[PDB]
Amino acid sequence: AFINDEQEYDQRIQYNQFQGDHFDLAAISTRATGLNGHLVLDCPVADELLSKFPDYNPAEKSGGLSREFAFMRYTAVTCGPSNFYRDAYILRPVHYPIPRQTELMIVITMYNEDDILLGRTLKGVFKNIKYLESKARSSTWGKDSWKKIVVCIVSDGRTKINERAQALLAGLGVYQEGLAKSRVDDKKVQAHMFEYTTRVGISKVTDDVVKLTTEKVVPVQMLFCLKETNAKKINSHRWCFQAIGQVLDPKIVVLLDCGTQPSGRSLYELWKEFDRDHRVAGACGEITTSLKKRQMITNPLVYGQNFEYKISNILDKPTESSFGFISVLPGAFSAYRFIALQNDINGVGPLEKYFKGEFLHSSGELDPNDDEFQMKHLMLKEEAGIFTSNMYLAEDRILCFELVAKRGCNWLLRYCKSARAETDVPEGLAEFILQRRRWLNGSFFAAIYSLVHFYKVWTSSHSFGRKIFLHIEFFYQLINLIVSWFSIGSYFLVFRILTTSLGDKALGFAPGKILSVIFLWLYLASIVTTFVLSFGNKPKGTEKFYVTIVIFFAILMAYMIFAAIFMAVHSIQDIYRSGTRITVSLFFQNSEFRDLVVATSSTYALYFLASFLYFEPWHMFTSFVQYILLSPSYVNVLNIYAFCNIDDISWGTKGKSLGEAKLREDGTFDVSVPISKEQINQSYLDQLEKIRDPAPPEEKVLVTNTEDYYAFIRSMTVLVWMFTNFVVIALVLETGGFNQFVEATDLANLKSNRAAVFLTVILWTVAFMALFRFIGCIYYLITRLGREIK
Amino acid sequence: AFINDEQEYDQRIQYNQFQGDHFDLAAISTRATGLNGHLVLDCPVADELLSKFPDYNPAEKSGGLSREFAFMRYTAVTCGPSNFYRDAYILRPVHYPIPRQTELMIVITMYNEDDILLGRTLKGVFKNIKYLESKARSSTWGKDSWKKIVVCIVSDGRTKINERAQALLAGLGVYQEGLAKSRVDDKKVQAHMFEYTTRVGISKVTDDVVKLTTEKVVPVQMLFCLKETNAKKINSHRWCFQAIGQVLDPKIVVLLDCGTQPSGRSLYELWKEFDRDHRVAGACGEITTSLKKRQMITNPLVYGQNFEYKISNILDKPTESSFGFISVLPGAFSAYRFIALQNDINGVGPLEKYFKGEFLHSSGELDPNDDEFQMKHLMLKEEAGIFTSNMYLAEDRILCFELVAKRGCNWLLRYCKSARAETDVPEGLAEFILQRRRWLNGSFFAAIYSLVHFYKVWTSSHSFGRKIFLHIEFFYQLINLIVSWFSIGSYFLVFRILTTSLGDKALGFAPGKILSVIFLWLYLASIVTTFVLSFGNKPKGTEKFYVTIVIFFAILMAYMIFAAIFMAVHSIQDIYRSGTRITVSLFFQNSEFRDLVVATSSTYALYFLASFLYFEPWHMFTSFVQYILLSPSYVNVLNIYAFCNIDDISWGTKGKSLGEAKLREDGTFDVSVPISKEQINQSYLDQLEKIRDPAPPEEKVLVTNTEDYYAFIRSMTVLVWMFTNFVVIALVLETGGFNQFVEATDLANLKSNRAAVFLTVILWTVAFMALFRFIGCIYYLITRLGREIK
Ligand SMILES: C[C@@H]([C@H](N)C(=O)N[C@H](C(=O)O)[C@H]1O[C@@H](n2ccc(=O)[nH]c2=O)[C@H](O)[C@@H]1O)[C@H](O)c1ccc(O)cn1
Ligand SMILES: C[C@@H]([C@H](N)C(=O)N[C@H](C(=O)O)[C@H]1O[C@@H](n2ccc(=O)[nH]c2=O)[C@H](O)[C@@H]1O)[C@H](O)c1ccc(O)cn1
């Protein structure tokens, strides 16, 4: 088990002086004393772990180690997040005789994750902490910097945590099996907290095994909170913010997920981003996809996701950062300023909005024995509108808007490209669809909520120009939402127009008509099958149907590109045939050539320039084709599945022995039945009276269950989506009854004109959005360079 | 509580001699002795119930009543249906010193039904038994006929049974609360059986209250089997047939449902049907809908259902009875010959097929403690094909085909119109849809199964002509299935053709085009909304959407009828305009007039004649319009909901405390945690070894859950249905890409020709099916009259 930039860190660190502070222990005889009336145990760690440390001395009973390094502390929490601070639950960092002030709380969320992912995450965090320690000419960082950093691991589900990750945590010395207790004082234990200052560092993380060693390891404060029952990531975040954060009172809370490995200096970059400008309240870093042992042709999906991530980080994040409002901060890797998230005195704030979703989106069955029964009952009893009851879709995204548009605060959201983190993307198609469901739903709901409540930014204390530019960004987001809502209809219209154009006898392509008909039939079949499977079955079961649909859509996209190229070439040849010389004006006057070629080429050129200026050009070659071929799948399959499954009904449906006869030694059976005449007569009369009366009306008027409400909401949403898309399609191609209002000959010309107008509109809208994003990223680069010079 | 044809029965009955036979009791001290090692208690009934009887004498301790009338017997059954006969479970009728042979077992099924429905059913049964007793010149019936009849009530769910119905049963004296025991000898009690010979008769059943009296009441044997947990009607029928039937060994088992009130002589008619011809194995009686306090205009749905039932009983049942094979025997009211249902020595038979559906269609989670674990494990372990695993759809319908096409037996199914029963139809729309789901699914699956396995009738020992006529019936059923599969597409095609015909400028109707377009859009919207609601929501929640859709379809049907009439009138006027005189040949040569008018008029005339010849003409006037207006709803809404919900997933998903710390008198908490160095080191080494190895491949290869299988089956079925219907529609109206293969002018003429051909085909197919059924019912009437003369 035990065996270049990192080397620089080791040189600056002495490694000889790591004596811990003395703290009061809890007596353990096996009666044990608990601090403040709570179940607290300070057990000793395995002797071998102590022996590994260089400072260990065989003569010393404990090796001469400090109290913190020698004993691991276990606490059982029964109250829950809401009352954790109210109760006298004291964490070790604040329990020292000299209080320790936290500067950076690194939160890690785990759920049945393999030991490899946790090992990679912990290796990244340890490397970042080592770099922070090694820093010499820093006012805040340097010697004894590890005392200001706390690593919190919140595992979701005691019975769902992977055994190998638990073994890894035990190897760190944080976790011990025997300590955990199910109940205390007839009260259920909601969470189990283990606190330990580990001096064990992960040397390397291979593909199959994890190797940890004690050589050149900086001490790290570890707090491992194991939850008794899984209550989702929102409940995990409630534990992190509402309960632990208040006790620790840290700044710049960093959120991480298992499998995300930050760089060697990324956390320092995030902290510097927060430190330079005091108005910044949230930050995010570039996220990258690993391509170590994945081939270009064997894994098209991975490379498509890589291209998507690179384009996002290069165009979308910089522009939003320039405007000061980021739609989404990646939960996998982001950071928030703690004070900015605090609610107002009135009780309304970003955290309240974020947490309300967990309470509202759940079965209305509250256990009276829970100590949080009053809070949940009050929250559910309150009248909730459409937006409040549907906050669960937005998730973290709501926090960004709530932070920017505060009543009287001046906060901003910023994106830094210096911070980089590597994560693992889902290789399988079913996992990809399941992941994209929530992304799409959250993005749509967040956009709608922000656009509807855009007036809230007026009261915020921002500069007038800042408000004007925020309004410009809101207008851009409105345009993007409108374009995204009509994605499927626009794709179908473009496909139909391009395929039918090949059917014209003017151009010499014979199989055009038959191919167009076959592709239309296959498209309709794929759409219908996708809808049926989305409503009925689970992605993991019927994966092959989705694979076939994706392959068909890739082939169709290839055919569409070929048709567009053929049409453009034919138009150019006709231009030359017409004679009278050729001029650039004539080329730009031809609708076919212009729309089909110029717009797409301009968009590609903008993407290429943006990639080059960021010194990340490879993704424009290695992973472009896969993304282009998969785009129709992105629009159709993912969007259909996301909209059909808006409601996430995780909870199930709903939720005195008469007697016991025991055979005795003899054949007789011991029974207790009525014997007296009086009681039998009384029972008979009671039955007669019970039946001898008319049936009263029920008039239950029960509130009923919430699952019906969310199912209704999802049904209405999908119906409206279908109706609008079909209205647009009927208007463009005269598909419905509109063809009756025209004649045999006028229909063709009118349809052609409408199709041309639609094509030019959509293509130029896409090109203009690309230009907008390009200019935004250019400005981001210029301003970042100028700030760096300063 | 206690207060003309029936009068005739009382006159013939002496009512003075009703002494019961003596039987051995079980000692009840409160240790009580059980017969054959089972928990059996013979408790005394309430003294007032004994006092009511005329034979009661105040001087006598028990009033002089017989043992059976004085004591009620309770038995606790733990084994279940499979092993009930194997175990020494003895029912009172077979426990007498002189064994009693059962002649007619009247089974009643109850599930949270109101006391009113049970009261009506029991009143009907008691009246039938009284009539049988009164019969004088009968070899089998007459004096002491009540000893040959046993009434079995199987209630589904101990905790779901309605309290008022239970009070009614207690008033009868069958049920007592104290006796029931949850467990015996550490074995769960599956069912609770109460046996009593009640002399209490229901005098009348008002709308709100039930009145029972002891005057002029014939004793009735009652066996009330209350099941501990609900396992559906198939499990109830398993209890009735597999377990009670074997012990009683009756003939002509009669099946009834709560709320079905048979006539005063209906059961005698069924028994006579069985007695006259020994080849008959199953029988059914006419079922009627009550219209006492329901208005023609206030309740259109009730009258539509009334018309449907009358037409069914007048046309469908007689023809199938004439052929000797009935597709469905109403479970609410039918009868079966017990010996015909018995399985073969090899273990294959109608009952095995019927019961296999319950076992296969359920969660694959068998409790090892069940005594039927071996049987269920063997059945599930066996390889099951598509048909065997989907038998749950057919339900009772499978029994009919399994009976007719036996390997070497000669059995027939017959329908008698002398037997009549009145039932309550669902007034609400949601209840109607829920009821029709299973009807449609069962009919479709039974038709498919019978058609596929038509060759099984070859080996049956029937006359050659009988086999020929059965094959003719199979061909007719194949045609009916084909017509029913394409119902929605045919309806849409007819609607589109009729609405577009009004758009032609030849006829002077201006709003035709706009109305056609609007109706097309509304039709598409209704279809899409129906599909979405069927997949997503529950009928009870979103009832108003269905109501609106039904109203729209009724309006559309009215408009379609108007359009057809207008077109026919215009065609006749053009015929007159053409000149050259008029002849019947010219009228029958015009496709428009012929197809639109002659076929529909012929069908209506056939229906009218069939109604008149059966002396039931009123339904052709009172309830015809409602059925005509609701037919499109029948085809669209019910069929869509039934096909979208083929899978009935009733079951849910899926299905050691670390320690306990108790605070003592002092502040210390009592805990048990590791103390010794050795155990801590051993645990640390164990964790190191656990993590120090590579991850082995899972390779679970688990069988997985069955719900996915049924969801997949339903998805495939709906997809195939959609594909076939759309193919037909595209072929007829040139809706898809087919229009590309024609020109501007030829398309209109070709579409018109195809539409005319489709209209004539469909209308004449309907007319010919109506004629076939009419001839069949005519033959049924003639043969029944001839048999009556004989
Ligand atoms: C999605 C993320 C990462 N791949 C991931 O999987 N995140 C999970 C999530 O988003 O839910 C985390 O949630 C935990 N979880 C799961 C189930 C539960 O029930 N409770 C619970 O806490 C999981 O263990 C996991 O750590 C990915 O890197 C990413 C995100 C944003 C982005 O812009 C780019 N990339
Ligand atoms: C449907 C029938 C009657 N209205 C009815 O409701 N039958 C129920 C059924 O068909 O299921 C019976 O099944 C019992 N049941 C219910 C739920 C459960 O979970 N377990 C259980 O035993 C119910 O109590 C009830 O007696 C109607 O008259 C009819 C039938 C056929 C026909 O051609 C014409 N009309």
PDB file of C-alpha atoms and ligand atoms in Angstrom, chain A residues 109-111 113 156 232-233 257-258 260 287 309 330 332 423-424 435 438-439, ligand 1:
ATOM      1  CA  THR A 109     -19.281  15.508  -2.831  1.00  0.00           C
ATOM      2  CA  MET A 110     -19.262  11.722  -3.193  1.00  0.00           C
ATOM      3  CA  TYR A 111     -21.947   9.165  -4.031  1.00  0.00           C
ATOM      4  CA  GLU A 113     -17.933   6.745  -6.538  1.00  0.00           C
ATOM      5  CA  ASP A 156     -24.480  10.697   0.233  1.00  0.00           C
ATOM      6  CA  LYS A 232     -29.562  14.205  -2.941  1.00  0.00           C
ATOM      7  CA  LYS A 233     -26.918  16.788  -3.758  1.00  0.00           C
ATOM      8  CA  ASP A 257     -17.077  16.588  -7.327  1.00  0.00           C
ATOM      9  CA  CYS A 258     -15.456  13.168  -7.329  1.00  0.00           C
ATOM     10  CA  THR A 260     -12.535  16.213 -10.942  1.00  0.00           C
ATOM     11  CA  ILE A 287     -13.095  22.155 -17.214  1.00  0.00           C
ATOM     12  CA  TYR A 309     -16.507  21.887 -23.618  1.00  0.00           C
ATOM     13  CA  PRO A 330     -20.134  24.476 -13.040  1.00  0.00           C
ATOM     14  CA  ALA A 332     -18.018  20.281 -10.518  1.00  0.00           C
ATOM     15  CA  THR A 423     -12.999  15.419 -15.247  1.00  0.00           C
ATOM     16  CA  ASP A 424     -14.345  12.175 -16.697  1.00  0.00           C
ATOM     17  CA  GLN A 435     -26.651  13.622 -17.532  1.00  0.00           C
ATOM     18  CA  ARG A 438     -30.936  17.871 -15.936  1.00  0.00           C
ATOM     19  CA  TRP A 439     -28.535  20.210 -17.744  1.00  0.00           C
TER      20      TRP A 439
HETATM   21  C1  LIG C   1     -21.559  16.297 -13.564  1.00  0.00           C
HETATM   22  C2  LIG C   1     -20.099  16.428 -13.211  1.00  0.00           C
HETATM   23  C3  LIG C   1     -19.609  15.108 -12.602  1.00  0.00           C
HETATM   24  N1  LIG C   1     -19.287  14.191 -13.663  1.00  0.00           N
HETATM   25  C4  LIG C   1     -20.721  14.508 -11.723  1.00  0.00           C
HETATM   26  O1  LIG C   1     -21.019  13.374 -11.844  1.00  0.00           O
HETATM   27  N2  LIG C   1     -21.417  15.339 -10.727  1.00  0.00           N
HETATM   28  C5  LIG C   1     -22.503  14.735  -9.872  1.00  0.00           C
HETATM   29  C6  LIG C   1     -23.791  15.594 -10.010  1.00  0.00           C
HETATM   30  O2  LIG C   1     -23.784  16.618 -10.741  1.00  0.00           O
HETATM   31  O3  LIG C   1     -24.843  15.266  -9.402  1.00  0.00           O
HETATM   32  C7  LIG C   1     -22.068  14.693  -8.527  1.00  0.00           C
HETATM   33  O4  LIG C   1     -23.237  14.489  -7.578  1.00  0.00           O
HETATM   34  C8  LIG C   1     -22.993  13.508  -6.797  1.00  0.00           C
HETATM   35  N3  LIG C   1     -24.230  12.857  -6.435  1.00  0.00           N
HETATM   36  C9  LIG C   1     -24.838  11.925  -7.375  1.00  0.00           C
HETATM   37  C10 LIG C   1     -26.083  11.251  -7.051  1.00  0.00           C
HETATM   38  C11 LIG C   1     -26.731  11.508  -5.781  1.00  0.00           C
HETATM   39  O5  LIG C   1     -27.746  10.956  -5.522  1.00  0.00           O
HETATM   40  N4  LIG C   1     -26.158  12.428  -4.824  1.00  0.00           N
HETATM   41  C12 LIG C   1     -24.860  13.167  -5.093  1.00  0.00           C
HETATM   42  O6  LIG C   1     -24.387  13.915  -4.324  1.00  0.00           O
HETATM   43  C13 LIG C   1     -22.038  12.471  -7.660  1.00  0.00           C
HETATM   44  O7  LIG C   1     -21.267  11.576  -6.775  1.00  0.00           O
HETATM   45  C14 LIG C   1     -21.125  13.442  -8.340  1.00  0.00           C
HETATM   46  O8  LIG C   1     -19.974  13.783  -7.427  1.00  0.00           O
HETATM   47  C15 LIG C   1     -19.301  16.733 -14.481  1.00  0.00           C
HETATM   48  O9  LIG C   1     -17.955  16.609 -14.212  1.00  0.00           O
HETATM   49  C16 LIG C   1     -19.583  18.169 -14.984  1.00  0.00           C
HETATM   50  C17 LIG C   1     -20.487  19.002 -14.331  1.00  0.00           C
HETATM   51  C18 LIG C   1     -20.718  20.287 -14.816  1.00  0.00           C
HETATM   52  C19 LIG C   1     -20.021  20.670 -15.950  1.00  0.00           C
HETATM   53  O10 LIG C   1     -20.209  21.959 -16.493  1.00  0.00           O
HETATM   54  C20 LIG C   1     -19.136  19.791 -16.551  1.00  0.00           C
HETATM   55  N5  LIG C   1     -18.944  18.580 -16.058  1.00  0.00           N
END
